[PDB]
Design a protein around this ligand. Structure first.
Ligand SMILES: Nc1ncnc2c1ncn2[C@@H]1O[C@H](COP(=O)(O)OP(=O)(O)OP(=O)(O)O)[C@@H](O)[C@H]1O
Ligand SMILES: Nc1ncnc2c1ncn2[C@@H]1O[C@H](COP(=O)(O)OP(=O)(O)OP(=O)(O)O)[C@@H](O)[C@H]1O
Ligand SMILES: [Mg+2]
Ligand SMILES: [Mg+2]
Ligand SMILES: [Mg+2]
Ligand SMILES: [Mg+2]
Ligand SMILES: [Mg+2]
Ligand SMILES: [Mg+2]
Lengths: 441, 441
């Protein structure tokens, strides 16, 4: 149970709305002391920013591990020669940040890792009985985005969990796809989000193994066309069996129309969605699952021996979650006039203690008591022990979006009561200060 | 309890001592399926290697936090404008990896973060009442080492925990320095190491505020002179009070002679250290604590308003732990002829189950029983369920360094017994199946 006293913390709250911020999420992240811009599209994560980033990572890691994925780490710097093997060194484009070392060797900050994971695989895996296999990392990306914008939403240095699956053939690769589908539905649900999987841009051989997970939002870049029925589908629980038939689940999700603007078909839209359920809106892309087949295993020669002594290129898929983008996305969906409203699973703290008369021996002594008690019980607690006046303590607390507040002061406390305020709806309640620890654990 | 079955893992064991490896720790990291080179000094962390790196990381973090330091995350790329402020852009030398983006703007992959952290601080901290403040992060660094060597021990892309303290004056900085001294003693102790605080090279302006923490090894790059009594000093428990006087803790560690080749004075060593106690050997620097006073605050005009009423530049110190170097150091100190011997705090798994007849209906059943039950009770458990023969399962288990092994074969289970083997000393015990969990739990 992680714990902090605000006076022992670094949380530089901003009084005014920063003029460089064009949207809510960006604006609130700067003002809640979560983020500092160091270059265009390149940010430092200040303490509170960091805590939520780490909460999000964990959830992503857990749902990857539940689905069978195995975690590694690839370096951020990759050699160009590896990318020359695939064709992509020159076909990728200006988004690639190329680097020369002291010896003039050609490097590049990885924008993605298809070549490097196929290179690691082909070194060690030679048989079909190793497969399916899915390896992932959570690692910093660099895309030299032409016009960085919207804070974490479109940065240059960003965090992606990217996972890549290896299979004998398409049929199997499809099984690997379906695992990730379900893992992603659960990943986003756990963050308080309805990230709807939409049919997305496929490659040249087309087919149907490309989806984008899109959080609905007027201020998003993706144009989207859905049947509203999609927004009410049930999400698999933690006990979903990842070795079984996942088809009946996927079919639930893929049976209602949901296409991005890239693959939308207006004829097919009408003749499938009732005008009643048609929503043409937009959203924020928080992940993407994509089957690529033998695109890298062909040119880089990643083969295995099949179940008939025969050598063939493996079939691949890639799966990406925008981990840092997600802080932006979550704030868009979870805010009000007074600031952030974190889902509990991602909040940097679960509870903040507001001393409403700092120094005063009765309130200080009660706030110390409540602090170490909740602290010792496993609860993530922030104790606002600063010199600030009450109204400032309230405003800061509402702003940084901590799920629950405990209001402690001379009025209620020198009478044996504290106040518990839920951030989500503003629900107030009075409790004896002995009973409140129990309420939260 | 982060549990895994070896049939569903990625652990590419290597039969033959790789030719590229010059020292034990690099050889075993490769053999044990922990590491894979992608360029000189740049490595992918394979699943078992990554798990160790994360354990080390968490220990480092927990100990920084206990001492009161506050975690953020600075980006890997920094502006050259930033380093021109300090003068260090052109002074740092050819280890700095310079990068030009698409708009011709000048960046670098940061080799250290003193300018960046002084820039964050100066944007926000204006008064001495915000001090002392320690901000730190665990981030990937690049240093274009002249000769990358010794695997992870001298990489180019490497992980460091770097902390940076801010204080009003020199007196206050020494206090910040002492907390990190104590935190480093605790950090390295928890890793099963004797990293010794040696007096190290000081800045141009002299003094007694530089210490390298060095784990002795015949083979290391650092030349060290010690009083052997230093190896037996006590390491403060976790209830050490950081807000109080740490001097008597520091004075116990500084009173025995210990110095690196660069500050060693033979005359003073002859005088202070009894002939029998004298020891001149090598070791691996795993950490450094360092005071730089006003070095960055001066050039970058990062002042606070003091208690006397007036403006003055802050005093700083930097404290670095080689997180990734630490896997090489631990293996050097903790191995035998059979492979790695992980201290259990940094070990990738706590117990490995070895099934000695794979497919035997009876022993499969007992292994699963054991696997699932050790999961549920908290234990990092590997179940080697592979189609290997016993002699191979012992060899891999020994090699990868897992602290405990449970040997399970048809013989012992007919008597309702199993073996528990300790990797470190080869201790073994024969006991009831129904009893093995309780010892481990
Ligand atoms: N510049 C960026 N900043 C932050 N997150 C990003 C960025 N680029 C991609 N992401 C995240 O990475 C995920 C997977 O990466 P992918 O390469 O599929 O993105 P993309 O299709 O190039 O994104 P976009 O179309 O937004 O530029 C995306 O779904 C998104 O959540
Ligand atoms: N090239 C490297 N590879 C791995 N770890 C390193 C490397 N350089 C530094 N470190 C780690 O970071 C810590 C602090 O960094 P610092 O800049 O003080 O190292 P340094 O003086 O450059 O040491 P070295 O003499 O090893 O180059 C070091 O104690 C070491 O453990
Ligand atoms: Mg893009
Ligand atoms: Mg896209
Ligand atoms: Mg995409
Ligand atoms: Mg060096
Ligand atoms: Mg050094
Ligand atoms: Mg050093």
């Amino acid at each position: 149970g992680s714990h902090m006293r605000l006076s022992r913390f670094f949380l530089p709250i901003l009084k005014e709305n920063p003029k460089e911020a064009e949207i809510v999420s960006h604006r609130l992240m700067l003002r809640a002391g979560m983020l500092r811009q160091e270059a265009a599209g390149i940010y430092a994560w200040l303490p509170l920013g960091h805590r939520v980033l780490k909460k999000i990572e964990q959830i992503v890691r857990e749902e990857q591990n539940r689905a069978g994925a195995i975690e590694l780490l690839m370096p951020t710097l990759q050699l160009a020669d590896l990318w020359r093997e695939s064709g992509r060194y020159d076909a990728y484009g200006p988004e690639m940040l190329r680097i020369a070392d002291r010896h003039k060797r050609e490097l590049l900050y990885g924008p993605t890792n298809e070549e490097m994971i196929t290179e690691i695989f082909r070194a060690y895996i030679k048989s079909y009985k190793s497969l399916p296999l899915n390896l992932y990392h959570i690692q910093w990306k660099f895309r030299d985005e032409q016009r960085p914008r919207f804070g974490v939403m479109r940065g240059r240095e960003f965090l992606m969990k990217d996972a890549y699956s290896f299979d004998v053939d398409e049929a199997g690769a499809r099984k690997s796809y379906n695992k990730m589908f379900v893992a992603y539905l659960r990943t986003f649900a756990r963050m308080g989000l309805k990230a709807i999987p939409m049919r997305a841009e496929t490659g040249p051989i087309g087919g149907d193994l490309s989806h984008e997970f899109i959080v609905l939002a007027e201020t998003g870049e993706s144009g989207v066309y859905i049947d509203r029925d999609v927004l009410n589908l049930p999400v698999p629980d933690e006990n979903v069996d990842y070795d079984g038939d996942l088809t009946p689940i996927i079919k639930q999700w893929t049976s209602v129309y949901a296409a991005t603007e890239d693959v939308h078909e207006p004829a097919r839209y009408e003749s499938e969605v009732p005008e009643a359920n048609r929503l043409n809106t937009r959203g924020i892309e928080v992940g993407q699952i994509f089957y690529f087949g033998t695109k890298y295993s062909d040119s880089m020669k990643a083969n295995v021996t099949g179940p008939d002594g025969t050598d063939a290129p493996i079939h691949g898929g890639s799966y990406g979650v925008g981990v840092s983008r997600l802080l932006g996305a979550i704030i868009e969906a979870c805010h009000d006039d007074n600031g952030i409203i974190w889902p509990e699973a991602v909040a940097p703290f679960r509870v903040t203690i507001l001393n409403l008369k700092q120094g005063d021996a009765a309130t200080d002594a009660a706030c110390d008591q409540l602090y170490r008690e909740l602290s010792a019980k496993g609860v993530d607690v922030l104790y606002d022990d600063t010199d600030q006046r009450a109204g400032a303590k309230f405003a800061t607390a509402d702003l940084i979006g901590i799920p629950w507040q405990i209001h402690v002061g001379p009025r209620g406390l020198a009478e044996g009561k504290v106040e518990l305020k839920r951030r989500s709806d503003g629900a107030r309640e009075n409790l004896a200060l002995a009973d409140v620890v129990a309420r939260l654990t």
